Symmetry: C4
Subunit: 219 residues, 4 copies
Amino acid sequence: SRPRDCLDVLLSGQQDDGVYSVFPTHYPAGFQVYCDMRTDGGGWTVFQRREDGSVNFFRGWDAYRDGFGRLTGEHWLGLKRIHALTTQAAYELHVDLEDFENGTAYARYGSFGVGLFSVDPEEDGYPLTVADYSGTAGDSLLKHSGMRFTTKDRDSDHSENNCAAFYRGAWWYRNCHTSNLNGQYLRGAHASYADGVEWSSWTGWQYSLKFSEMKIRPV
Amino acid sequence: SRPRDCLDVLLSGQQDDGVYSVFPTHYPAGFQVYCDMRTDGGGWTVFQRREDGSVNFFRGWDAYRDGFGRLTGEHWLGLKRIHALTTQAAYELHVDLEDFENGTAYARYGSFGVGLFSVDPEEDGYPLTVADYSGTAGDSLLKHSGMRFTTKDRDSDHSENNCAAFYRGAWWYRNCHTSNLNGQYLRGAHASYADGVEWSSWTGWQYSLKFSEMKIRPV
Amino acid sequence: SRPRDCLDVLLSGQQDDGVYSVFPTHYPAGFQVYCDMRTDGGGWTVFQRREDGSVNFFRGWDAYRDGFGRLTGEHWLGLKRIHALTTQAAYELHVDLEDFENGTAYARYGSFGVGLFSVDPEEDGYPLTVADYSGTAGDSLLKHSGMRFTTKDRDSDHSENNCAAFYRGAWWYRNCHTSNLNGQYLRGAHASYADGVEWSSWTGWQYSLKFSEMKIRPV
Amino acid sequence: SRPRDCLDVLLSGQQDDGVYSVFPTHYPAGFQVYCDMRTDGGGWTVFQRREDGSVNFFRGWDAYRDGFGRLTGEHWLGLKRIHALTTQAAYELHVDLEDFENGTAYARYGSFGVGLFSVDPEEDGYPLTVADYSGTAGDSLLKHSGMRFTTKDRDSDHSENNCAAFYRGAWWYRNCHTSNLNGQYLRGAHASYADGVEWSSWTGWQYSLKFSEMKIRPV
Ligand SMILES: *[C@@H]1O[C@H](CO)[C@@H](O[C@@H]2O[C@H](CO)[C@@H](O)[C@H](O)[C@H]2NC(C)=O)[C@H](O[C@@H]2O[C@@H](C)[C@@H](O)[C@@H](O)[C@@H]2O)[C@H]1NC(C)=O
Ligand SMILES: *[C@@H]1O[C@H](CO)[C@@H](O[C@@H]2O[C@H](CO)[C@@H](O)[C@H](O)[C@H]2NC(C)=O)[C@H](O[C@@H]2O[C@@H](C)[C@@H](O)[C@@H](O)[C@@H]2O)[C@H]1NC(C)=O
Ligand SMILES: *[C@@H]1O[C@H](CO)[C@@H](O[C@@H]2O[C@H](CO)[C@@H](O)[C@H](O)[C@H]2NC(C)=O)[C@H](O[C@@H]2O[C@@H](C)[C@@H](O)[C@@H](O)[C@@H]2O)[C@H]1NC(C)=O
Ligand SMILES: *[C@@H]1O[C@H](CO)[C@@H](O[C@@H]2O[C@H](CO)[C@@H](O)[C@H](O)[C@H]2NC(C)=O)[C@H](O[C@@H]2O[C@@H](C)[C@@H](O)[C@@H](O)[C@@H]2O)[C@H]1NC(C)=O
Ligand SMILES: CC(=O)N[C@H]1[C@H]([C@H](O)[C@H](O)CO)O[C@](O)(C(=O)O)C[C@@H]1O
Ligand SMILES: CC(=O)N[C@H]1[C@H]([C@H](O)[C@H](O)CO)O[C@](O)(C(=O)O)C[C@@H]1O
Ligand SMILES: CC(=O)N[C@H]1[C@H]([C@H](O)[C@H](O)CO)O[C@](O)(C(=O)O)C[C@@H]1O
Ligand SMILES: CC(=O)N[C@H]1[C@H]([C@H](O)[C@H](O)CO)O[C@](O)(C(=O)O)C[C@@H]1O
Ligand SMILES: [Ca+2]
Ligand SMILES: [Ca+2]
Ligand SMILES: [Ca+2]
Ligand SMILES: [Ca+2]
């Protein structure tokens, strides 16, 4: 009765999409998550969802560490929880996207982790590990591999300015991004440059997507 | 020997009203609570009690998060503990009231929860879920459903001012309240408007009740 | 292998005085304590020791909450740990004293607790419960029963001034004390009034004792 | 499946050098460490590594308490973790060194601990216990036995100045050091006095070593 993630939940015989308790190896108090039990056989732990612009994603370091929003709607699970999940086994990442024309695409990454070898993942800036792309959305994440997480109030990017401030989001920014899924909910085509919910490989630098979901499952 | 609430305590063969250790799913350190083993067959976990005005209830955010008073007297268990209890199963709420003429009434709610789907219940303001009224006191809580918790130093209400400051309490204020059980212990009829221990549906807007107890049990 | 106190350690077959790991009900991480396995059959958990004046006891709230000194020498275990121990069962208190003439005396209290019913024992000031005196030192603690703990930087006493500042210690001060075992190590008779390691019932108001040990065991 | 250290990992049949989860007695959440499964039969828990100067070691108290760097490279595990490991059993210390001429030497200490009897190891300054030298590097640590840990922002040394500031490191400084393995990565011979990665007994006061590893195993 102590599943470590949504795959453990599924394999214990819980087949319905919804909110479940999980207990990562180094987070034994555990916490609630949204489980996707449908995509590619199910067992995905959601850590990010955009769908309606109801939640402010232009938040500081503490909010991105601790999480915000609601599991049933738009949310960010929190980097401390994403670290606890991704360090306990080898995980893949699934990213579901939707445009405002009801077009959908996905990106799959064979390996995904946050601060995997960091003694203090918070001080080390929750650095991204990501490799092995496949899917229909194209790759907009591999160039982010190795980058620390940057917020408007904590700059660990490779730009002379703050990428999070400039592109109004929070991400593993380099100089600055190919993806920006925590960017502003600008609702489709926008004149502003690359500061919406962007996945450059699918819809370019000036299209804020309607829906994103980022979720993990052990390989 | 790890009951999750006062019902687990009762069903393990502890029939006496009093203080017991409970261990919620996501609060495994556990904590002590007052158990009501009498009301409607027993197994109720108390989280609020007014009885004599001996404890200051006009407290800030941190006090309402962490709890205050004593389990054997006037107390608030703390929103972090009420979140830990109400997210681990489906709970009902029982509210016992007494006026200064030894009149008593109660309100029962078939569903009750605090920050049930909140990634960070503290940042999300411990929002109230409450439905399905029955009893003798009348309903003074259903209009509060969906509201965040507001204190004198943290305003998440739907008023242009701070409802907690204005009505000298701490509650899931809208604009502003039908109930105010954490209000001032003004002892019966008062000239001041709605700033005492108010349950509007029973005793109106200018009567501070002698006794309140708010308690939960799994359905 | 999870003893809750020094009595559990003793009954598991550890007969030697020394440092052991204990795991109180609501402090499951556990911590190390000094166990007295000799006094009245053994199984006493030490929480205070004076013996040489090597450790500064004139410390603030945080130090008295979290503890200081070393388990093998002069120390204060910390009110958070003393709360965790005394709330998990019914404990007695033993107080061993020594003067500078190698005279010894003790006080035994049939009941002892710190913040026993406090929702937040820290905010409630770790109030003392103590009753049922017997021994050779006389009673210098029963008048302290019901008092919150006062430090130089947090005044919860019944004096118009700060008793901890005035008598250079930290205690469940009333107005102000009959005992002051966390007072200055003034080494025997002193001109200053009641600001040393005082046990008034044995050695009066102007004698700083050489040795004190305060320790607990379940009845 | 809850090894307390790298020796428990080894004896469970994990023979490969690498990163593993360990669960110390009083740190039950556990954490990841680098295990050396080769040196003198294996089972060593690494807590310090220098190899390339890629990580800043001139850090403050909080960084030395909580840890920094990466387990696969240069890192400091953190004094809170080193306290949790060394208080749960009797440990020996192994120190591996390398100069820039591919010369190697080691120091072995039959006993090693950090804040072993400290009620609050952080407030007590994580004092060093170390005894019983043998090896090829010579002894540069025994004179540090009994000293608290000093950083540039927290001075507990026996110098009139701050040893950590003066020798640009963080250590159990006396007045001031025979070893300085958290000093600046100055890369071999340097004109500056004793402010590099120094092991005085092997390479003197003006030679910053290429590689250091500090690791522990139960005797
Ligand atoms: C894009 O998908 C949407 C979600 O399924 C469609 O809206 C939904 O249409 C349902 C019937 O298919 C209807 O019951 C739902 O109420 C509605 N959902 C929402 C969120 O509005 C949408 O369909 C268009 O809009 C609706 C309201 C109807 O007028 C349809 O005829 C429209 O095509 C899809 N959009 C397009 C452009 O196809
Ligand atoms: C309202 O209920 C109160 C609590 O039961 C009553 O007071 C209690 O009366 C007991 C005998 O019934 C007595 O032993 C208790 O000491 C007392 N409790 C307290 C808290 O005072 C109260 O009764 C009135 O007051 C008491 C002191 C007597 O004088 C009675 O004759 C009074 O009726 C009840 N009040 C009324 C108005 O009935
Ligand atoms: C009070 O008790 C002390 C602790 O036992 C005595 O000192 C100890 O005496 C031991 C022999 O009995 C000796 O081996 C210890 O080294 C010594 N301990 C310390 C802490 O000094 C003390 O005895 C007096 O002082 C010692 C040094 C001798 O000179 C004795 O002859 C003295 O009586 C006791 N004091 C008195 C006044 O009896
Ligand atoms: C000191 O040890 C180093 C690590 O083993 C040597 O460098 C390594 O040499 C390997 C072949 O032995 C080679 O495959 C590795 O790429 C290389 N590692 C690194 C980190 O460079 C080093 O050997 C000297 O430098 C290398 C590049 C060659 O030119 C050798 O001929 C050199 O001797 C050793 N240094 C000395 C002075 O022996
Ligand atoms: C959103 C984003 O990161 N855009 C960045 C672009 C693109 O990387 C480039 O056009 C390749 O598409 O490069 C810069 O102009 C640049 O190199 O100075 C910085 C700018 O921040
Ligand atoms: C205690 C309380 O909340 N009273 C509020 C009342 C009642 O809601 C209303 O009289 C229905 O009974 O409405 C207001 O006057 C209003 O709408 O502007 C605000 C006031 O704060
Ligand atoms: C150490 C101590 O508390 N002394 C206190 C004494 C004794 O309580 C009293 O002499 C009975 O022995 O009373 C006071 O003088 C007083 O009542 O004003 C205050 C003073 O702080
Ligand atoms: C690195 C270091 O600690 N050097 C110290 C040296 C050596 O201890 C001494 O030369 C023995 O080798 O002593 C001092 O000069 C001294 O005593 O005043 C202080 C100086 O900080
Ligand atoms: Ca930057
Ligand atoms: Ca407001
Ligand atoms: Ca006072
Ligand atoms: Ca100094």
